[PDB]
Design a protein around this ligand. Structure first.
Ligand SMILES: Cc1[nH]nc2c1[C@](c1cc(-c3ccccc3F)cc(C(F)(F)F)c1)(C(C)C)C(C#N)=C(N)O2
Ligand SMILES: Cc1[nH]nc2c1[C@](c1cc(-c3ccccc3F)cc(C(F)(F)F)c1)(C(C)C)C(C#N)=C(N)O2
Ligand SMILES: Cc1ncc(COP(=O)(O)O)c(CNCC(=O)O)c1O
Ligand SMILES: Cc1ncc(COP(=O)(O)O)c(CNCC(=O)O)c1O
Ligand SMILES: [Cl-]
Lengths: 442, 442
């Protein structure tokens, strides 16, 4: 007693928009540092009937029976995760149930410190995530600042994490957890120094590596598994999996931590797991542990270095003057245009990027930067040579943005009016669409 | 620079288990009250490239651009939802971002009351959910009992919600929210009476209708939208959607609730939405609002009544002696077997059900019932005639369970030893597999 007609016959209205969405993705230069494109096999898992099953609990500790095949998939996923991140299952545990990055960080934080617990994290404005304790004078913006007591550490004026400030804060604040790994940080992290600071105050070390996870797995960047008690990551960014999260815990360092984490994910926060997510994650973790994926990750870094170097050749300033990873943050102060203005301009030319704060910024309204990344475009086959064109397109959009601002003024409402119909933008979009439309698309 | 091989070529190990899972689903008599089977169209959405997109924020208020088509899908979803639940978009608002039911409840609860906030809900043992404030002497099991202050109200000895007790509790406890709508409750709810109690104490009315959402939408059962401040529901159960949740808020009763609820989902708890989820939900919400789906829902109730009646003709006791909905809870005390033993017996015969508490039960360990539901089997085309056979199968499983307990003893370890190779079970399973295997499968 069901309708088995395909999506196109069943809901033509919805199917058009999805096909529209498909066309926009394939015709866009996607520089969102956190975005990627999943392969058909990962999308087959996400559409699988495994999502039908309710399997509250953990493998071999299910509330319900009929979970034999589900248990194999959840165990296959945990093995592949520990393998991919070069950790021993005797020494490290992992939870595959968190639905997304934010849920996983909140669940993990709760496990470690509990309600009213004290946490330290990097500020959103300096490159931290919302789930790292972010609040504002006006509001406790994140649950992580409301169900926990949070202190926030700023990066220095050159955009690097300033450890002296971190230690100064840890000794005075005395938190139970200190979080590192960030949302818009273009450089590598000194985990060892974090581990040294955490010990002095007897606090846990929490590394959130969602943005750089692939780098850590393939040993191109510093390894937080050597020093951290907990490691969290999403699977949908540089890792190129579905939208999900992973929580790693150091049993050797903290016995009895497995129970706290596992009980935090369920039943403290979540109910039934999403089995299609888990199947999809397993599928990508196998790809992650192949010499080919290491190649791709290497390619992402090469493209990022080349992109940075080309932007600098065109007189564009980058925060910290470059990158050790997949992402770059452009300081736009010399051009006197805001990041929101450039983002608007870039949408008009089918270039996806995001406005981003810089060290000088005092407000999340009017940020002075944009953040770009290479993983999506690297997934689409762009090589080092292709980055000069991306940099050229961005330089042209900056100039166009300056021209329009000269013509209509700094008020964002007035600036947007200049955008529709602009000859140069229509031309620029056209070149963007023609090059973007050509590239391999999973 | 990606691998486009199909799932079978790319991951044969994973692909076999999924086909295994598929075959077990198709060969099982699925009586899990919270389970259903999604159509190909809903799974096409789940596998869609829309999940590649990051769209933090809300429609027309996105952090990033390139969200034109994503915005159409989110607005189309909220529109379709409000229509389905027969509410005016002027009077009610809905949030479509929550990843699952538990997340949605925690988010909604936080919006209304905040940290340390006072809430009241039905106890887990009486048919309430974990997200309704569940705690135990040994620990605060749900975040809802830890981040909030919760009081729990029990049903009476006949299995009915006892309003006198709720009022007694509300006036004494003075919570900001009172929750109704349950995980294992076989009868309808008097929302009006709840609305009265809440007014007496100035508390919000929260209805969780995930198990009965279809009955509320198609108007076979009482409408909580008439009385509640908030309605929450999952989309993966009777509604037949993907795994996701919806949060409804009454704007007329509480202006400025829209912002409180919306900010709670993001950026308080979650980050990026899962667009494939939202797309999937829109697709099912269209089906919900068709006269055909009302027929299916009607059929779920016909099947449930018939099943209760057939169980009773076989001398099996039901909590509240019947049902007003899709679910039944069987009291097993007269047979001196526990729910866990019957669940084990039922997995051996490919009958999916879950152990459940009954009013007499003091502790969650060793519960004296099993909960069954008709939505999955109704989805597979089972009519009222087919229920006598299901009831017959369950009667045989109870008898066999009693015989095995006689042979091997009441200890769970000892009882399970009798299970493998049992001639009657092999026979019952084969009978089960033959009938189940034949039914339509989406
Ligand atoms: C959307 C998002 N999610 N997690 C994040 C952001 C960022 C961000 C967040 C916010 C923000 C502020 C208050 C409340 C909610 C918010 F999302 C404002 C801005 C800004 F300034 F550019 F408008 C940027 C950015 C990557 C998009 C951000 C940055 N920078 C950081 N570090 O982490
Ligand atoms: C798994 C689940 N999720 N939400 C639920 C349950 C139930 C349940 C929950 C628990 C439970 C207890 C402590 C901690 C975590 C738990 F999941 C124990 C039992 C039981 F009785 F079978 F042991 C049953 C049931 C539908 C499966 C339950 C019931 N009854 C209720 N009302 O809501
Ligand atoms: C370090 C980090 N942690 C957690 C999250 C949360 O992931 P979910 O959105 O799946 O909840 C993000 C997302 N960062 C947003 C971006 O970089 O674009 C992140 O950058
Ligand atoms: C009333 C109610 N609310 C929330 C949930 C949880 O939704 P998620 O599992 O998607 O978090 C359930 C599922 N209860 C388990 C069952 O009935 O089988 C429920 O019955
Ligand atoms: Cl999903």
């Amino acid at each position: 007693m069901f309708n088995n007609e395909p999506l196109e016959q069943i809901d033509k209205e919805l199917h058009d928009i999805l096909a529209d969405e498909e066309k926009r993705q394939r015709e866009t230069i996607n520089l969102i540092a956190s975005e990627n494109l999943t392969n058909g096999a990962v999308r087959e898992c996400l559409g699988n009937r495994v999502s039908n099953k309710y399997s509250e609990g953990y493998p071999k500790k299910r509330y319900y029976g009929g979970n034999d095949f589900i248990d194999k998939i959840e165990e296959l996923c945990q093995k592949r995760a520990l393998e991919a991140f070069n950790v021993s299952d005797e020494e490290w545990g992992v939870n595959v149930q968190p639905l997304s990055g934010s849920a996983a960080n909140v669940q993990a934080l709760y496990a470690l410190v509990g309600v009213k617990g004290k946490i330290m994290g990097m500020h959103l404005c300096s490159g931290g995530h919302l789930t790292h304790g972010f609040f504002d004078e006006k509001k406790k913006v994140s649950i992580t600042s409301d169900m926990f007591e949070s202190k926030l550490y700023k990066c220095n004026s050159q955009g690097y994490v300033d450890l002296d400030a971190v230690r100064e804060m840890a000794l005075s604040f005395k938190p139970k957890v200190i979080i590192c790994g960030y949302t818009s940080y273009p450089r590598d992290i000194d985990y060892q120094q974090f581990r040294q600071i955490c010990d002095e105050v007897n606090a846990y070390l929490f590394a959130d590596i969602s943005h750089i996870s692939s780098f850590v797995a393939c040993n191109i960047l510093n390894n937080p598994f050597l020093h951290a008690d907990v490691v969290t990551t999403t699977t949908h960014k540089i890792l190129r999996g579905p939208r999900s999260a992973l929580i790693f815990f150091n049993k050797k360092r903290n016995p009895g931590i497995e129970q706290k984490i596992n009980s935090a994910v369920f039943p403290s926060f979540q109910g039934g797991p999403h089995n299609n997510k888990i199947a999809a994650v397993a599928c990508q973790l196998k790809e992650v542990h192949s010499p080919a994926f290491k190649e791709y990750t290497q390619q992402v870094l090469l493209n990022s270095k080349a992109l940075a170097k080309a932007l600098i050749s065109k007189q564009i300033d980058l925060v910290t003057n470059g990158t050790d990873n997949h992402l770059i943050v452009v300081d736009l102060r010399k051009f006197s245009i805001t990041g929101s203005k450039l983002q608007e301009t870039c949408n008009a030319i089918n270039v996806s990027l995001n406005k981003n704060t810089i060290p000088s910024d005092v407000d999340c309204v009017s940020p002075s930067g944009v953040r770009i990344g290479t993983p999506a475009m690297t997934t689409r086959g762009a090589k080092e040579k292709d980055m000069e064109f991306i940099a050229d397109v961005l330089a042209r959009a900056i100039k166009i943005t300056v021209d329009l601002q000269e013509q209509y003024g700094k008020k964002l409402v007035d600036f947007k009016k200049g955008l529709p119909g602009n000859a140069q933008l229509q031309q620029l979009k056209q070149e963007v669409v023609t090059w973007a439309g050509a590239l391999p698309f999973p």
